[PDB]
Design a protein around this ligand. Structure first.
Ligand SMILES: C[C@H]1CNCCN1c1nccc(-c2noc3c2CCC[C@@]32CCCc3sc(N)c(C#N)c32)n1
Ligand SMILES: Nc1nc2c(ncn2[C@@H]2O[C@H](COP(=O)(O)OP(=O)(O)O)[C@@H](O)[C@H]2O)c(=O)[nH]1
Ligand SMILES: [Mg+2]
Length: 168
């Protein structure tokens, strides 16, 4: 049967979670997507010769630490932790998302990728070295993406699938 992988995209508002997801789903850049919409989207893809079904939850909205939201996030098999390379605050929020994932999955070993998005923009405030070093601190891959140009988009999502496969 076709394996389904449940991927969750997290990160500060405005980093490009929706734009990255919609680039994977539609193969089109969106400059506008209601910031409040949290939804899931599926796509069949071939990864390492295997056709698999990705189910991508594009998160949104305010923090909610209910038992119900925790149980829902625990359905995620792997997480993309996204910041924007021109927004320091988004990078400094990554530890919060990482800690919430560790908490809800009750594991220090959750499939995860650190994603530095908006790599097409000239306004960089987060050095690549600092981001690489954070991914090294976590023991996870780091991928530089642009939802606008498609830079890194398959690399980010496919790497996460490969991390889930290895965790199994
Ligand atoms: C960086 C902080 C603190 N400073 C203010 C902004 N902020 C902020 N804003 C908005 C949202 C989130 C946030 N935090 O965790 C989460 C989010 C949204 C995605 C879901 C997730 C991560 C995956 C595991 C769990 S489990 C659970 N119940 C969650 C929730 N909700 C989460 N943090
Ligand atoms: N240039 C550029 N803009 C981007 C990129 N990704 C997202 N954006 C823009 O950043 C803003 C927020 O993107 P959005 O996907 O709504 O972020 P979300 O709140 O994380 O879902 C929008 O205007 C997007 O067009 C990217 O890689 N490059
Ligand atoms: Mg969004």
């Amino acid at each position: 049967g076709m394996t389904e992988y449940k991927l969750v995209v997290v990160g500060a508002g405005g980093v490009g979670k929706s734009a990255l997801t919609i680039q994977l789903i539609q193969n089109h850049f969106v400059d506008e997507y209601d910031p409040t919409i949290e939804d899931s989207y599926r796509k069949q893809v071939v990864i390492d010769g295997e056709t698999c079904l990705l189910d991508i939850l594009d998160t949104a909205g305010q923090e909610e630490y209910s038992a119900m939201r925790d149980q829902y996030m625990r359905t995620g098999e792997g997480f993309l932790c996204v910041f924007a390379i021109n927004n320091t605050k988004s990078f400094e929020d990554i530890h919060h998302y990482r800690e919430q994932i560790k908490r809800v999955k009750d594991s220090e070993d959750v499939p995860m990728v650190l994603v530095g998005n908006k790599s097409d923009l000239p306004s960089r405030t987060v050095d690549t070295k600092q981001a690489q070093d954070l991914a090294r601190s976590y023991g996870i891959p780091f991928i530089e993406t642009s939802a606008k140009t498609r830079q890194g988009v398959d690399d980010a999502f496919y790497t996460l699938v490969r991390e889930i496969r290895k965790h199994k």
